[PDB]
């Protein structure tokens, strides 16, 4: 009603989820997703991620596993319940349970 999920991932995953029914041009004329190709810089990825975090109206962010691991320090630097971020599997990188920030909160409880 007032919150729109966001997706960051390779061309395949962003295409899939933008089919899945997300992404919207807001009043400032921006999407709610980033395309990360082979020709992308980690710095640009963090810049867009911080912009999304500052955008309160997103609520949920979806990132695939290896990108979440590629930027692991800055993703863990933010702790807060409201702006949820979820790691999801991908094609050549199936999801790894042993690497997940939310599960690090439940350390040793296995």
């Amino acid at each position: 009603r007032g919150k729109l999920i966001a997706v960051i991932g390779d061309e395949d995953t962003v295409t899939g989820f933008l089919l899945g029914g997300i992404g919207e041009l807001n009043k400032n004329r921006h999407p709610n997703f980033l395309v990360v190709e082979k020709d992308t810089t980690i710095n640009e990825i963090e810049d867009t991620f911080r912009q999304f975090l500052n955008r309160d109206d997103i609520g949920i962010i979806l990132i695939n596993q290896y990108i979440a691991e590629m930027v692991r320090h800055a993703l863990d630097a933010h702790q807060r319940s409201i702006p949820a971020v979820l790691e999801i599997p991908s094609k050549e990188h199936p999801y790894d349970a042993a690497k997940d920030s939310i599960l690090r909160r439940a350390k040793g409880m296995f």
Binding site: R1, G2, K3, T15, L18, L19, G21, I60, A84, A106
Partner: protein, 213 residues
């Protein structure tokens, strides 16, 4: 520090006993709260793990649906990337009251708009419709999981702070009150025995003067 600074007296004992009783009741209330929150923490963690292991295989199914569609139709990534204007899925705020606090969760909703109903009209779109259905189901499940994880973090923080207060009370207040009460008891006994000595002495002196006659 060592004992609450109060001059010992008969009323002081009952006052400090009442304080100890109140502290014990507060301890009990915080302990039950911690237990209930911890049980819910267990349940939500197990549910998250289950939902995630299912989310993996459904995402694999959706990925293979994409692969099927890429053959039957070819490639349409630019066509769907560069025409985003409005969203078809929406999220509303919600909360659930558990253990006296609110757990924030999210309501998944179908927005009645549409932006990709006509794409691939002639080349072929059956695989596209299958991909559509698969990603709709995946989005539903992911919203469910994200709500669970947000509530999970909130509940963990709540457990942390209730146990914080429990340990503070248990490891500070009780021994202080006990030490104060013991000091009060010792001082009362001291005063009593001094009074006894003084009465005993006056009685002995009275006997001494009486024996003269």
């Amino acid at each position: 520090k060592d004992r609450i600074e109060i001059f010992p007296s008969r009323m002081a004992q009952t006052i400090m006993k009442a304080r100890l009783k109140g502290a014990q009741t507060g301890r009990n209330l915080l302990k039950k709260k911690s237990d209930a929150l911890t049980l819910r923490f267990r349940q939500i963690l197990k549910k998250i793990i289950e939902t995630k292991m299912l989310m993996g295989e459904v995402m694999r199914e959706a990925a293979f649906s994409l692969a099927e569609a890429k053959f039957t139709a070819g490639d349409f990534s630019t066509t769907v990337i560069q025409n985003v204007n409005k969203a078809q899925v929406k999220i509303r705020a919600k909360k659930d009251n558990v253990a006296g606090v609110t757990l924030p969760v999210f309501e998944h909703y179908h927005e009645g708009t549409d932006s990709y109903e006509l794409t691939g009209l002639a080349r072929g779109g059956e695989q596209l419709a299958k991909l559509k259905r698969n990603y709709a189901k995946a989005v539903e499940l992911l919203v469910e999981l994200a709500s669970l994880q947000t509530s999970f973090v909130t509940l963990d923080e709540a457990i942390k702070i209730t146990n914080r207060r429990v340990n503070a009370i248990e490891h500070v207040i009780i021994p202080r009150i006990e030490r104060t009460l013991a000091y009060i008891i010792t001082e009362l006994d001291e005063r009593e025995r001094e009074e006894f000595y003084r009465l005993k002495k006056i009685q002995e002196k009275k006997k001494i003067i009486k024996e003269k006659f």
